[PDB]
Design a protein around this nucleic acid. Sequence first.
RNA 1: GGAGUUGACGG
Length: 533
Amino acid sequence: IDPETSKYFSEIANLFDSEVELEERSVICGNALEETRGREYEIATDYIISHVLQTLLEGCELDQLCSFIRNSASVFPAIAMDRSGSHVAESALKSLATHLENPDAYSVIEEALHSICKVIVDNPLDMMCNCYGSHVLRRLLCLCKGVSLDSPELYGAKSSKALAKRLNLPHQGFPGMLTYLLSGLLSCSREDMKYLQVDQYSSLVLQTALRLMLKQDEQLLEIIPLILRCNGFHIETNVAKEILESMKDNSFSHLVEVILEVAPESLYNEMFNKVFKNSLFELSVDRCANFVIQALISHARDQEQMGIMWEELAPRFKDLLEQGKSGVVASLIAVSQRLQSHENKCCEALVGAVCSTNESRISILPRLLFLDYYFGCRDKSTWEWAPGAKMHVMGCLILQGIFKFSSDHIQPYITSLTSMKAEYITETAKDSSGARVIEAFLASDAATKQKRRLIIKLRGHFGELSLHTSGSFTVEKCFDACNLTLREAIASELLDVKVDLSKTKQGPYLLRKLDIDGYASRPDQWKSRQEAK
RNA sequence: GGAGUUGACGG
């Protein structure tokens, strides 16, 4: 990097910080990329100029992008594993992806992908394990699949969407290039594969590839035995022992979670029996492995498996809540619903784990709303509430699930919730997790008289509730469930705060759906229209 | 327009 090179790329950078329209902008972007020929590694890895080279790549036309990828392909793994050049490699890929929807570019993108996949597949294992290169590889696998849109779920992150699925709450791409690239990533010795399993960044790469092969059974049946080192699909006794001992490892545990999420039926069952079938509780108490069990539970196929999971885990619900593993319980409860097995056994086991004595069972709701305060407190026989405290996210999720069982199985839950005193019920609705418990109860098949009894204890608080963004949903769901007398009561309370309510994000919608303006001006006509529903 | 598990990731 000489001063004429720095000067020139600085001067291009400063020209775009204006005076130059987009049609000229992209021809300048390409004439400048030609100034990188023979210097691609030096420019792309420079801590300053690499940022300009990103701008050029995201601003040039297809022919010059592909020319840059063809010229730098022999140094592309080195660029991709540099802390600055990896954003350059990803910028080349993001820019390539913008031409996906152009039918006239299919073979020109494929040729570019091929230059890249060829140089990577020739030597992949340090790029897979490199903290920068594994981001480039994850993006590259997505592009070969025709996904151009960053999904934190594909790149390995948590979200609320995956949590819903676990709890029950498209471009053709370049198929042969995805298969070719991924065969290159997995064609190493079984001994190399054993350390890919437990390295953070190669695990993240294989997670992305697995998620992209979702529902490609013919391919998933070739890939997963390779990743698990066991080449009908069969896991031998010693391989199953090795899989099981790596299962508490941070990186591997994330990988088996995704294997369980995409595994075909034949392969799920073999892993259930040969790997997990008598270690479910021991894995459920591990920092890392318990999420594998959550993934195992969520994807069970038949009722025989439910019974096995029930036997090993349900006597141990209390341990799982005590030891911070509420998500294992939540997953077991949620799948008994979909498999239609052990529903009542699951509801009764959860009560028995939170309430030892017959007397304490009226308190199942508060103790589950505040799971961590109840199990964490000094004296449990005199624990009642946690005033002002934020309620427990997973406790409340468990309860959202509980209230989708038939009412026959959840009577201790309906009685406990509907008999909480008004101060506790209003506190629950004002809490962003607690309002979801209430709303799940309002949508349950509990009786109307039982729903109305809870709604009536909220009287005097619908105004304050409506101002909360979250509480505004509870007000509406209560209103819908009510008779004319309480509909008119809620309207009066919302009417006393119409000024504040209109100045909030959800206020306008709430004043419209309940028609609070028409209640104030023409109360006779509002009562008539409300009675017809 | 809603709280979102207890264990990871970049110049």
